[PDB]
Amino acid sequence: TSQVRQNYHQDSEAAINRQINLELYASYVYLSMSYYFDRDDVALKNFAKYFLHQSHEEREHAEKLMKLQNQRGGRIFLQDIKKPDCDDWESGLNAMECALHLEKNVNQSLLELHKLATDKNDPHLCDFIETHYLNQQVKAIKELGDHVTNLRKMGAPESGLAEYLFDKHTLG
């Protein structure tokens, strides 16, 4: 057993490894979305920039969990990073809707992780999740909701003009 380990349940250790994989998966989804908008037949450069930034943020989220695993004396166990659900994302609106779904799924995982940490009476882990993950998720979900609403109200996905102008005004 690690010389640093204290009050860190094996179930929590395992759950943190699962969360690391999920964050990496989220980074991969956003990477794929980014380059969809870089296609010559889609060509929305600010959608591409927005999603690439999100992808880099998720990689940071994964790294912080790997750091946490080591800080607590757990051992990192990595799994394959699954390819994203979709190859073709259809429209800016559709990609934003996929992102919203993804972030709500990640949030659910984090809430399940918090429930476990609470059940195992691990207040350090609870605080870690609360401080570095929960409000970040709420902000991300709210922002994606805002984006979806604006695209819908503007006439997306039918209106190519709507997605073009959203690209310039909101994401530019």
Added chain:
Amino acid sequence: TSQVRQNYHQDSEAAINRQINLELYASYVYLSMSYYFDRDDVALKNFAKYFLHQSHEEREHAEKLMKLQNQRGGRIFLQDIKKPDCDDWESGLNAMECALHLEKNVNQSLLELHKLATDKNDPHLCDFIETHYLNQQVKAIKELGDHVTNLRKMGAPESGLAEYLFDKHTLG
């Protein structure tokens, strides 16, 4: 009687208390409007910013009247601040129309206050109203009229695109 009181009719004192309440009410209306546009299903951040600024301005208007009451030796009497007429404001255009109606109502109250001050031969109070309130109201009403006109001409409220673009170009 206050050692500072001079040429300040009890009717004017009472009217100033009523105006304080009205200014606070106006601040509350604009606060409510602001956060309507912050909803994930409305999501017009510059409408939200615009109305929040207006709300803060009305609170300043109320404070200046409270200061005036004390300067003249009257006594402040506060009443409940009523909740705004509407919870749901429908659209950017509708909120602007509500604001226009509100500011015209506040203007009418100020004109009635000025008539009273004139009738009681209180030139200090007349000058106070004229200097700090009347042109501010005329400018606010004109600006809201301008906003309503632009939103209508652009195709609001039916056009979600119109409200989106107005949010960026006029309020951004």
Added chain:
Amino acid sequence: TSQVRQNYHQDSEAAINRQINLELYASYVYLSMSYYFDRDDVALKNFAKYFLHQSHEEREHAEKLMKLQNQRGGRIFLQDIKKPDCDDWESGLNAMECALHLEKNVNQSLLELHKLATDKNDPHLCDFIETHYLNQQVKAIKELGDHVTNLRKMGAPESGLAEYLFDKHTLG
């Protein structure tokens, strides 16, 4: 149901609306206290400044809760802001005692809100309350306690000199 809503109980939503009203009420109490000390027959300008600052802080507290409501996909429901308990606050000491009572009441409401959030297993809401409200309340209560103690020890409310000197040294 809001596209952003996740793990946010209707009871929590309602409690947040109640808290918004309470914060606005607290802003109103402090506004009234501020202008009491601005009266020509009270004339303690630093008491007035202190309470006006507190009033503005409470308005910020209310706005942050309105922001939270929208972030979580709840819907803001506003109620009348009740006028403060007292019109005449008697002395600096009495106003400080009223403020202490108010802040302890607001704290109790926040603790009840936290209990609800805990019961509904909402760790994001728990963290929000803990981060933005609980220590702020403890600091405010401690500061008001300190102020009350000093005024008492100095000879308030009988000693007009005590309140005058406290105004200059502690609040100035």
Added chain:
Amino acid sequence: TSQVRQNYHQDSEAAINRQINLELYASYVYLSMSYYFDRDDVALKNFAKYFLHQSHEEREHAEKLMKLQNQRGGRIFLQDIKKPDCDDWESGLNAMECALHLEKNVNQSLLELHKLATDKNDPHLCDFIETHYLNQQVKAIKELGDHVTNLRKMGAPESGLAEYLFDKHTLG
């Protein structure tokens, strides 16, 4: 008749000359008060500074009225500047009370002047009085009221300590 004179009643011209004398008288009262506090047996240097500043302000008030008289094509008529009512002012509190009485008397004169200007349909003169005199008077009266209140509450005039500390904290 002056080549510049227009809509300027002879009664208004005369009233402006009377006001010039009153402003000069007020400057003289404050000059006398100032040097009372400079006496070795009174020795409150900030009371002395405060009243000397007030004296200089009144001289400016008189000059602006002399300027107005010429701007409108009236002719300045000067009278003796009467010595102040009191030679000995007793205490800081008593001097502040005398100043309050003086400023209320000057205010009454200005209100009478405004009534005359209104009766003679002279909106330029009304605006001049409103802009340069009326709120200045209200502020002065309020400030003197505040000062009187503080000195009383502190224990003046019996307490030499009260007047000493007021000199340092409020006027210093």
